Write a protein that binds this ligand. Structure first.
Ligand SMILES: O=c1[nH]c2cc(Cl)ccc2o1
Length: 126
């Protein structure tokens, strides 16, 4: 049901947290080859997460579940801010701009955590 799809979406979000933290560690340590691979992995993970979030939102709409639709619209908007910041982080790595990369790393953590306080109202509304 929409809830098994939400559990999968939550798990993909958790996989992205895991890979993100390993990537941050590699960035701090100067292992640029590892960072490149983790950034490619995160891009794939964000694409999969977005696909699951869109299926959840579209299903809540087809059910006319007004509260779930509202929360999912808000959450997906914040998720997109995170993705825009992630894309800018990718570009800073490409350009050799470690100062900007550090700053985006920090920004992406805070925006991702902000989206998460909606996650538990979403699970109860679905
Ligand atoms: O659940 C998952 N984990 C995944 C990791 C990559 Cl790289 C792509 C899709 C995924 O879906």
């Amino acid at each position: 049901s929409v809830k098994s799809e939400y559990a999968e979406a939550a798990a993909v979000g958790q996989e992205a947290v895991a890979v993100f933290n390993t990537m941050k560690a590699a960035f701090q340590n100067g292992d640029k080859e590892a960072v490149a691979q983790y950034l490619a992995r995160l891009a794939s993970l964000y694409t999969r997460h977005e696909e699951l979030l869109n299926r959840i939102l579209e299903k809540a709409r087809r059910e006319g579940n007004k509260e779930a639709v509202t929360l999912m619209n808000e959450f997906t908007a914040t998720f997109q801010t995170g993705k825009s910041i992630f894309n800018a982080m990718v570009a800073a790595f490409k350009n050799g701009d470690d100062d900007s990369f550090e700053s985006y790393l920090q920004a992406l953590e805070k925006v991702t955590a902000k989206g998460e306080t909606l996650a538990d109202q979403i699970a109860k509304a679905l």
